[PDB]
Amino acid sequence: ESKIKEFFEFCKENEVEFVDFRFSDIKGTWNHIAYSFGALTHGMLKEGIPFDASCFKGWQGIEHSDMILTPDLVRYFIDPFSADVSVVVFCDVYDVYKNQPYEKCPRSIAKKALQHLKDSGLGDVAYFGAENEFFIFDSIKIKDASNSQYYEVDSEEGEWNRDRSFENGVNFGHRPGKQGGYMPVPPTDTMMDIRTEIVKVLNQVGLETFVVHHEVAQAQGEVGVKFGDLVEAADNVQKLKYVVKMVAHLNGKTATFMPKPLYGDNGSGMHTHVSVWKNNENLFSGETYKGLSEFALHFLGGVLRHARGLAAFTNASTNSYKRLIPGYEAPSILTYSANNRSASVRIPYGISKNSARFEFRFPDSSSNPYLAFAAILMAGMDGVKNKIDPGEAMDINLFKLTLDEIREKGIKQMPHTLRRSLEEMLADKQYLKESQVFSEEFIQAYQSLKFNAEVFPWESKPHPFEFITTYSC
Amino acid sequence: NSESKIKEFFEFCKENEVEFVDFRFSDIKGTWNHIAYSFGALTHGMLKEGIPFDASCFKGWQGIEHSDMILTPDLVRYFIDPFSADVSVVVFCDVYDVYKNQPYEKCPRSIAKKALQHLKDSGLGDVAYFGAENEFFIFDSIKIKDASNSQYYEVDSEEGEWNRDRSFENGVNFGHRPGKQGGYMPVPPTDTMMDIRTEIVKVLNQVGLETFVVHHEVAQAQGEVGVKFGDLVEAADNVQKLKYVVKMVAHLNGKTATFMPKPLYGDNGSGMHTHVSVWKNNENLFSGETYKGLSEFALHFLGGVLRHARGLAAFTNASTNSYKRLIPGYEAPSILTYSANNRSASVRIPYGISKNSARFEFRFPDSSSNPYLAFAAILMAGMDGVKNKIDPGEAMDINLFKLTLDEIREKGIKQMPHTLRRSLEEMLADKQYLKESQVFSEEFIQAYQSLKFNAEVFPWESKPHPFEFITTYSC
Amino acid sequence: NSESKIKEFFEFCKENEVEFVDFRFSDIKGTWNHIAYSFGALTHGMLKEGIPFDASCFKGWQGIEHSDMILTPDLVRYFIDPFSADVSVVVFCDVYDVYKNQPYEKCPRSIAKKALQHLKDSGLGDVAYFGAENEFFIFDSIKIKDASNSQYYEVDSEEGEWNRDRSFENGVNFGHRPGKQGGYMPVPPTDTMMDIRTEIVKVLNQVGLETFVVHHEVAQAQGEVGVKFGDLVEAADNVQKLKYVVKMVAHLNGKTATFMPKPLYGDNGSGMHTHVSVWKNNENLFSGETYKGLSEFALHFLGGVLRHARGLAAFTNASTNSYKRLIPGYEAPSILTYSANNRSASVRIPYGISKNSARFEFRFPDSSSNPYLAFAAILMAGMDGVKNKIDPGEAMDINLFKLTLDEIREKGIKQMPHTLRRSLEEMLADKQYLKESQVFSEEFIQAYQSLKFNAEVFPWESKPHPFEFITTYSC
Amino acid sequence: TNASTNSYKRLIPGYEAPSILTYSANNRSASVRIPYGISKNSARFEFRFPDSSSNPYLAFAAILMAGMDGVKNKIDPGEAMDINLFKLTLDEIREKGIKQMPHTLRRSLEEMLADKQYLKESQVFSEEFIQAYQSLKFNAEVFPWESKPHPFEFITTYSC
Ligand SMILES: Nc1ncnc2c1ncn2[C@@H]1O[C@H](COP(=O)(O)OP(=O)(O)OP(=O)(O)O)[C@@H](O)[C@H]1O
Ligand SMILES: Nc1ncnc2c1ncn2[C@@H]1O[C@H](COP(=O)(O)OP(=O)(O)O)[C@@H](O)[C@H]1O
Ligand SMILES: Nc1ncnc2c1ncn2[C@@H]1O[C@H](COP(=O)(O)OP(=O)(O)O)[C@@H](O)[C@H]1O
Ligand SMILES: Nc1ncnc2c1ncn2[C@@H]1O[C@H](COP(=O)(O)OP(=O)(O)O)[C@@H](O)[C@H]1O
Ligand SMILES: CP(=O)(O)CC[C@H](N)C(=O)O
Secondary structure, three states: OOHHHHHHHHHHHHOOOEEEEEEEOOOOOEEEEEEEHHHOOHHHOOOOEEEEHHHOOOOOOOOOOEEEEEEOOOOOEEOOOOOOOEEEEEEEEEEOOOOEEOOOOHHHHHHHHHHHHHHHOOOOEEEEEEEEOEEEEOEEEEEEOOOEEEEEEEOOOOHHHOOOOOOOOOOOOOOOOOOOOOOOOOOOOOOHHHHHHHHHHHHHHOOOEEEEEEOOOOOEEEEEEOOEEHHHHHHHHHHHHHHHHHHHHHOOOEEEOOOOOOOOOOOOOEEEEEEEEEOOEEOOEEEEEOOEOHHHHHHHHHHOOOHHHHHHHHOOOHHHHHOOOOOOOOOOEOOEEEOOOOOOEEEOOOOOOOOOOEEEOOOOOOOOHHHHHHHHHHHHHHHHHOOOOOOOOOOOOOOOOOOHHHHHHOOOEOOOOHHHHHHHHHHOOHHHHHHHOOOHHHHHHHHHHHHHHHHHHHHHOOOHHHHHHOOOO | OOHHHHHHHHHHHHHHOOOEEEEEEEOOOOOEEEEEEEHHHOOOOHHHHOEEEEHHHOOOOOOHHHOEEEEEEOOOOOEEOOOOOOOEEEEEEEEEEOOOOEEOOOOHHHHHHHHHHHHHHHOOOOEEEEEEEEEEEEEOEEEEEEOOOEEEEEEEOOOOHHHOOOOOOOOOOOOOOOOOOOOOOEOOOOOOOHHHHHHHHHHHHHOOOOEEEEEEOOOOOEEEEEEOOEEHHHHHHHHHHHHHHHHHHHHHOOOEEEOOOOOOOOOOOOOEEEEEEEEEOOEEOOEOOOOOOEOHHHHHHHHHHHHOHHHHHHHHOOOOHHHHHOOOOOOOOOEEEEEEOOOOEEEEEOOOOOOOOOOEEEOOOOOOOOHHHHHHHHHHHHHHHHHOOOOOOOOOOOOHHHOOHHHHHHOOOOEOOOOHHHHHHHHHOOOHHHHHHHOOOHHHHHHHHHHHHHHHHHHHHHOOOOOHHHHOOOO | OOHHHHHHHHHHHHHOOOOEEEEEEEOOOOOEEEEEEEHHHOOOOHHHHOEEEEHHHOOOOOOHHHOEEEEEEOOOOOEEOOOOOOOEEEEEEEEEEOOOOEEOOOOHHHHHHHHHHHHHHHOOOOEEEEEEEEOEEEEOEEEEEEOOOOEEEEEEOOOOHHHOOOOOOOOOOOOOOOOOOOOOOOOOOOOOOHHHHHHHHHHHHHHOOOEEEEEEOOOOOEEEEEEOOEEHHHHHHHHHHHHHHHHHHHHHOOOEEEOOOOOOOOOOOOOEEEEEEEEEOOEEOOEEEEEOOEOHHHHHHHHHHHHOHHHHHHHHOOOHHHHHHOOOOOOOOOEOOEEEOOOOOOEEEOOOOOOOOOOEEEOOOOOOOOHHHHHHHHHHHHHHHHHOOOOOOOOOOOOHHHOOHHHHOOOOOOEOOOOHHHHHHHHHOOOHHHHHHHOOOHHHHHHHHHHHHHHHHHHHHHOOOOHHHHHHOOO | OOOOOOHHHHOOOOOOOOOEOOEEEOOOOOOEEEOOOOOOOOOOOEEOOOOOOOOHHHHHHHHHHHHHHHHHOOOOOOOOOOOOHHHOOHHHHHHOOOOEOOOOHHHHHHHHHOOOHHHHHHHOOOHHHHHHHHHHHHHHHHHHHHHOOOOHHHHHHOOO
16 A cells, blocks of 8 residues: 555556556466556555456356456556557456465466575575567468468568569668578668667666667567566566567567577577576575586576476477477577587576576577466476586587487487477476465466467468478378 | 290280380389380390389488499289370389399388288288278369468369359359368269269279279368279289379369378368288188177287387378378277277278178378388288287277367377377387388388488478467467 | 169160269258269179168268168169269169168158158058159359358349349340349240250150159249159159259259259249149049049148148258248248139149149248158148048138238238248157158157257357348447 | 347357356356445346347336336246356256247247236336337348348258
8 A cells, every 4th residue: 555655646647548457368468458547446456457267268267257357566667559648557367266366377376486485495586587589570471271371471681572572663682691680780680770669668668678689580689678586577578578569560560479480590589597696695606617506506407307398388389399490599408508509508608796697598488478487496496405416518519419319328308399398297297386386277277278279289280391292192 | 023924014015006114113202203115125134134223312212322223023913004195004113122132121012012921921811901992182273382481382172162252264153062071972063073083983994903982072172982902012002003093184184183181171181091801711811700790810910900000100191291180070080999880990890791891991091101011011010919919909889089188098098199200209119010020121110210200290390380370479 | 672673773784884873862951962883893782782881971860980871772763874974873772770770760761761651551542642843043153151250142143133234245235134023934035044944854854754844933043844743752852853953954054053942032932842642542532522623631631731831841941041932922832821723822722623633732842851851741741631630721812922910910820930940849849740650750850950950040040141230230 | 138130149159148047156158147346335237148239228128127027026036057057058958947048039029029017017118119119120120130041051052
C-alpha cells in the first residue's frame, strides 16, 4: 500500500488513459487485458483482475475457468506505441482454487526459483544476461494446406533479391552475403537508423542498453541489455520483444525472434550470461580456473549435467533444433572453453572480479524466459550441493571434429530434436522439483503442450524436401 | 545365364526386331537406373561376363578410385519396353564386384538372392512367396522449392478438395469430387481414373505381370493394382516393373505419379502392404490349425517380424516421409500387434484363408523402401522367428486408433518408431539376424545407415519446416 | 446364382470380348461404388462365394477392426459399360456378412430384397411394381467453397436467366432462353438438349432399360426420361443404372449433371416420382371400383403410406436439400393428402387408368434418397396399411398450395416435415412397421440414424448460411 | 434471446457457448455461470446464452418475466452440474434426462408459443404482439433458412 500509492500518482502525472495488465502463458506469449483507468481502484491491485484461464493451453479446464491475475508494481512503463496513454503492468496468475500463486504460472515458477536460492543460502541474488538475437524482415508468407506446405521470408538485403527489381526497376546493390552481416557499414547494413530507434525505445521503457550491432545473418541484429535479477531479466526479455516487434511494425516491417528462419545462415540465439552473488561478492569469481571459482565450476557442472533435459525448457521448439547444427556460431557439444564460440558454454574473455560469468550459448528465444531462466538455476544449484565436476575444457574448434570421434571420445552432446529433449527432461526432473519449484502437474501440463503443439505436428506434416528426395521412389 | 537361355534371348530379340538392349539395376535407395546398347553391338560374351559401368555415381557403392564395376545380366523376366519409341528390351542386372571378385555385397538384388538362397540352404523351406500391393497417387502437377528463404511444395489433382471453387478450361468446374478420404470406391464421374487405370493393367500385362484387382483407393487421387505373388526376388522385380509402368502411363497421359507414402496431410497414405507365405515341397508351411487357419511355423515367423520390427522398419519404411504415414487413423499401423480382419493392426490375417492362401499381410512397409531390401530383411527377421520359436503374443482385435497414449504405453505395446533416425538406431542395435550367412554384410549396413542419415535424416532435422513459422515466428 | 447363370455369364463375356469385370454395389447414402478385376483372373469359384473388400470405408458399415466383408455377385441386369475405353462388364453385387454369416443387414440392396420377399411370404401379393420418374439438371459449371470465412455455391448453365446479358465465345450471346419455370417444353433453340437427351435414352437402351417419354422439364436446365416399371429391386437397380448413364453422358458432352433435389432457388425442384402397384396371380390388386379405378387394397395401401409418411420421408427424402424442395409453388407436395390429377398433392392417381395401369404416383420422394431403402420403406409402410386396413382419409381436390398458414393447421391436414432432423425424429419414433419380419433391422436403423445426423443435419445446423448475413450482419 | 437462425450456429458445443440447461460456478460450459467475484454487492448470474441478434429491450424483458415467475412458483433450479458439460455423449444426455437449448430458431419459436402465460403477466407481453413477433421471425428467418439451398449440400448431395 505504498507502491500502490506511488503507482496511482505516477498515472496522474503522465495522463494515463488505460491500465494494461500483461501476463505470460506457458509458451511465453505475453498477453494483455486492459482496463479503463477511472475504474481502477486501490481495492483491485490487491483483489486482482479476473480473467478466463481456460483459453490458455496447459492451464485451466473449462469448468474451473475463473482465475485472478495479481498486479505486481515494479518495472511498469508507458507504452511507446498506443495512441491513447496506456501504462503496462506485470502480473502473476493467482490460483483461486488452491488459494496460492498459480503452480503453472512461469513468472511465479521463476519467482519460486529466485527465492529457492535465498532459502538454500547458496547465494542471495542470481543475475541473468540475455543477448536476444533477432531478425527484421520485409514480408512473411506461410501456408498449411492438405496439399501444400510453404514459407518464404523476405528482406531486401537477401541473396534471393540480387537479381530483383524494386520500386522503379531499380536495385541499389550493396548486400551482405550468406553469413555476411558482421559487421559492414551502410548502406550494406540497411538497419542502422532503425536499431538506434529500438534502443531509444528500450531506454524509454526502462531497460539499460549498451551495445547495438548487426549480427552475422542477413537481416540480423542484437542489443545488449544490462543483466538483471533472474525475474527482472525475463521481465526485460518480454519487454525487449514487444519493443523490437512493434518498432518493426510501425517501420512497415516484420520482425521475429525465432531460432532458425534461414537455412544456411546464422540463427537468432538467446546467449544467457549468468553469475550468482551474495553479501556484495560475485561467487563465480575466484582463482580455480581462468578467473573462476569452484562454486562456479560446479554451478556449471549441474547445467552440463541436466543439459539434455534442460533443453526442453531452454530450446522449446522444433525450430530450435534446426539451429543446433555445427557450423553457425551455435553450439552442439556439451562442453566449455574460454574465448570459444564453438562450445556450449564460453567463458567471456572480459573477465574481472565483477564480470566473472558464464555465457551459455545454447538457449534461443523460443524458450519462455521465465521457465528458461528458472531451470538454468535449479540445474546450477544442483551443481553446487552435489559438487559435480564440469569435466575438462576443450580448447578445440568443436565443429570440425569427425562425427565418429564424438561417440568414440564419449563426449555428451545436445539433443537432435525436441521429442528427444522432452524425454530426457521427463526421465530426470528431480532437480527441477526442489521445494516444489517446478511442480509435476505443471511438468506434465508442459509436455502435453509441447508434444501436441510442436512435436506431433512436425512429425506428421510432409516436408517440402521430402518431395525432392522421395516423390520419385 | 545358361547358354541356351542366351540363345532364346537372341531369338526373342530377333523375332521382335530389337533395336536396343536396356540393362536395368537398382541402387540401395531403390532407384531403377538403365544403360542401353546397340543390339548389333551386343555379343554372346557380354551376357556371360558383364557390362562395364561407373559405380561411384551411387551413394553407397564405390569410391571414385575403385570406381569401375560390372553389371551381370540375368536373363529372366525381360520384356519389350511399352514406352520407348525404338524397340528395346529391358534386361535385369546384378552388380559384380571386380575387386573382391564376387556378387556385390551391396547390390540389393544380390542380397535378396542371398536371402532367398539362405532359406533354401537352411531347409526351413524352398520358397518365400511375396505379394506386394503398391498404392499410388496420380497428380496433375507437383511444385517444389528448396532455397534458404523458402520451403514449398504443392500437389495438384482436379479430384482435390482444394479445387471445388476453382476455374479451369472456360471458367468451368465440373463438380463430382470424392471427399477427403472419399475416393473408395465410387463410380464415375467422381472416379476420374477408370481408364488410365485399365491402361496401366493392360501394360502391366504386356511386361509380364499378372493382375487381378484394380480399383480406386481412399485418398483423393489414389489407386491400386493387385498383382500375383512371386518368389522373393521375382516379386521385388515386379515391384520395379509396376512402378515404372505406373509412372510412365501417367506421364504419357500428361500426368505425374508418386509412390511416396504421404503426399497429402489429412488424407490416406500410400503403402506397400506385403503379403508373405513360405512353402516347402509344395505345401504352404503357413497353413495350419493353430490360429485362424495358420500354423506354428507361420506364427513364429510372425514372432520374428514383430520382434525385429523397429529395426526392420529402417528398411521397410526407408524415408522420413514414411513416418508421416505411420500416424493413427488412415488404415496405417502404429501398434506392433497382429489381428484378423483388422486394418488398425500391423499384421492383418485376411478372411478368405485356405491351404493356398495361408499368409500374412504386413501393413507397415511403404514404397519409399527398396523392394529388394525390405523383402530380404522381412525374411531374415522371419526365419529368426522360426529358428528361435519367437512368440508373437496374442492378437489384439480392437480399434487400436482409439487407444490413449497412457493406455498404449501402460499395457506396454510396442509401436512403430516415430522418426527415421530412431529406427535407424534400433536397426544398428540389432544387426545379427540380418548378418546370418553373410546375407546382409556388415559393410553394407554401414553404407546403408551412412547413406540414409545423410540423404534423409540430416536434411529433415536441419531444414526449417513451414508449419514452424505458424507456431514460432511470432515468439 | 446357379451354375447355369454362371455358364451364360462367362459365355456372354466371350462374345463381347470382356477384359474387366466391374463389380458394383450401393452404400447407405446410395453412392454407387465399383471395383474391377482383370477378366482372365475371374473364376467360377469366385462368383459363388464372392469378392472380399474393405468395408470400413463406408459410413454406417463395419468398423476398422472387423473391416473384411464379402461382395456377392448377382448375375441379373449386367451390361457392357459404354463409357470405359477397355471392354468392361458391370455386375451388381450384395454385401455378405462374414461374422454373422448372412446377407448384410446394412446392405440396402439386401434390405430391399428382404422387403420383396416379405410381401411374398405375407400372402398379400406376388409382386410390387415400381416406376420411377428421375428428373435431373444438366449444368455447365459448378463451384463450391466450404471455408471458415466463407460459404459459396454457383451453378452455371447457358439456359440460365442469370446469363441473358453475358458474353460467350466471341463477345456473343444467342438469346432464346426459357425463363424461371419456363422449360416445359418449348422446341429448340430454347430447348438446348434435344440431342443430349436422345443420347441418354439410347445409352439407356444399350444398358438394358425400356424407355418411353423423354422431355425437358419445367426448370431451366431440367429433364426426365420415362422408364418402364420394374420389380422393387429391379426398379432400384435401374435407378442406379440410369443415374450412371445420365451423369456420364453429361460428362462426355462437356457438362455436369445432378439429381440433387433443389439446386436453384425460385425454380422447380428435382423429384423422384414413384409409381407403385401390387399384383398377385397376374391380377393388379390395385384395380377396382372403390375410388377412381382403384381397389380397396389400393386405398388402404395408400392409407399405410400417408400414416407413416412423416417417418418414411427420412428414408425417401434423405438429405437436408430434400426439404428445400418441399415447399409450395413448384409442383412438389408439402401436404400429406391424395387427389386424382392434382400435382399439388402428395399422391396423384394418374388419369389414363386401366386395369393394367392402376397405380399410385407418390410425388414426395427425391433422388437423394437411397432407391433400395426408399422403395423397401414404402412397401413396408403400405403393407402395414393393407394388413391394418388403414383408411387414407378422403381426397383433397384443390390447389393445396393456396392453403394459408394457420388454415392447413386449422383443418388438421398433416404435412411433410420441415427439416431432415424432424423427419429423423419421426422415423425413430415409428420404426415397428420397418422391422416387421426383420426387414429393417434395428441395428441398421441406428447406423442410418447416426449416418444422417452426422453427415447432413449437424453440418446444416452448424455452418453459416450466406443469407444469414443479409438479415443479421447489421444486427 | 437467440432471435435469429444465426444464433443456433453458435449454440454448438466446444466454442465457450452453452448448449446444456444447467448452471455452475467458474464454468463457461454452462447456461448460467456464477462469477467468483461474488461479494455482497456484486451477487449476479451470468446468463451466457443470449446474443446480440436479440432486440435487447425484448430480451431483458423476457429474462425478467421468466426469472420473476421463478420466484412466485418457488421453481427449483436443480443440482449444479459442475462438469465440462461439453464432454457429455449424446446418449448420456438423453438418458440423464437433461434439458438443452433448441437446435433451431423454428423450434424455440414453437417452444415459446406453447409456453406464453408467464410473459402475458400483467399485460407485459401482448398476445397480439407475441403473434406479430411470431410471424415476423418465421417469415424473415425460418422460411428463408429452410428454402435457400446451402453450399454444403452440393458437397453432400450434388452427386447423390
Ligand atoms: N451486481 C451486479 N449486477 C448486475 N451486473 C453486474 C453486477 N456487478 C457487475 N456487473 C456487470 O456484469 C459484467 C461483469 O463483467 P466482468 O468483467 O466481471 O466479467 P466475467 O464474467 O468475469 O468475464 P471475464 O472472466 O472474461 O472477464 C459487467 O458488465 C459488470 O459491470
Ligand atoms: N556479472 C554479470 N552477471 C550477469 N551478466 C553480466 C555480468 N556482466 C555482464 N553481463 C551481461 O552479459 C551480456 C553480454 O555482454 P557483452 O558485453 O555482450 O559480453 P560478450 O563478451 O560475452 O559478448 C549483457 O546482458 C551484460 O550486461
Ligand atoms: N499364398 C500366398 N502367399 C503370398 N501372397 C499371396 C498368397 N495368396 C495371395 N497372395 C497375394 O496377396 C496379395 C493381396 O491379397 P488380396 O487378395 O489383394 O487382399 P484384399 O483384396 O482384401 O486387399 C496379392 O499380391 C496376392 O497374390
Ligand atoms: N401398374 C404399374 N405399376 C407401377 N408402375 C407403372 C404401372 N404402369 C405404369 N407404370 C410406370 O409409372 C411411370 C408412369 O409414367 P407416366 O405415365 O409418363 O407419368 P407422368 O405423366 O406423371 O410423368 C413409368 O415408369 C411407368 O412405367
Ligand atoms: C483400402 P486399404 O486396405 O488398401 C488401406 C491403405 C492405406 N492407405 C495404407 O496406408 O496402408
